[PDB]
């Protein structure tokens, strides 16, 4: 599989540099987008290289969506072209695997209608504007969606996504 | 199975963390264990907290030993009582994951004559010292006991190490 991660500056660090590895074991590509190439700096001060940028992506060429929290969603939901990719590939019925506030960029995707899943709640309020049913628990299975709430979930959020790899 | 990690404050926050998170997906029990109990504190500032004492550990509980690196091992190497959870736990043939300052622990255990590992290069002196030979690769494989050297290493590090769990 290609594996897709949509990140900036600002990542929780855990959220994405624990899935980058689970799924590496896998022996799946993975691929960090962000705003440019080069380097992205988390919450906590851990570094990752950012393989493509948000421009040169082809939806169509990978299988899967990563979408970890942080304060980086807040400023990735602002991109148009990171929100197509994001509307084709769960339109498409692609895993997505979210976590925290991975899900502001669903929410600006207009993709959350009538899906189930949660989140951070701290925008449990903002998830229901957008017409999803939240609910709270350390992972939810909506088809394709898998969505966590926080680091303490990690375990039970890639139980359940390499699940939809496989 | 019930896997042991041994650590304290300094520790590299993702060698301990991500592998912890690994390891209950596959639903074993993990443990961290330090000087007393409560919470210690990674180099990036990631909280954990302390299940047992060194002090309340019997070797025999234990299925599994993991050791991480940071600052924690250059401390932890002096308790006699985590010397000897990691001699017994070691020299039984229970599986050892060890990454990056990690083998601080096993040298001054008194474990590494004549085994075979890695750990980050600027210990390298200091394992070969100790009586094992130094390998520079992502992980290494002998017998029981799976060593890798950075984080960059965490995907290869717990594939091999996942499976002497089975």
Known sequence: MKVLFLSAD??????????????????????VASFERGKITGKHGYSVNV??????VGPDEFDALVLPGGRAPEIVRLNEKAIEITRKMFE???????????????????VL?????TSTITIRDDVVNAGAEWVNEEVVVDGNW?????????????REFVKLLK
Not at 93 to 108: D, E, M, R, T, Y
Not at 113 to 117: D, I, L, P, S, Y
Request: with cysteine; charged share 25%.
């Open 10 to 31: 600002g990542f929780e660090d855990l959220e994405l540099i624990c899935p980058l590895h689970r799924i590496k074991e896998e022996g799946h590509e993975v691929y």
């Open 51 to 56: 393989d493509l940028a948000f421009e040169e």
């Open 92 to 110: 498409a019925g692609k895993p997505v695997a979210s976590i925290c506030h991975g899900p502001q960029i669903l929410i600006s995707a207009g």
């Open 113 to 117: 209608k009538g899906r189930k899943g």
């Open 146 to 158: 898998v969505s966590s709430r926080h680091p303490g979930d990690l375990y039970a959020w890639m």
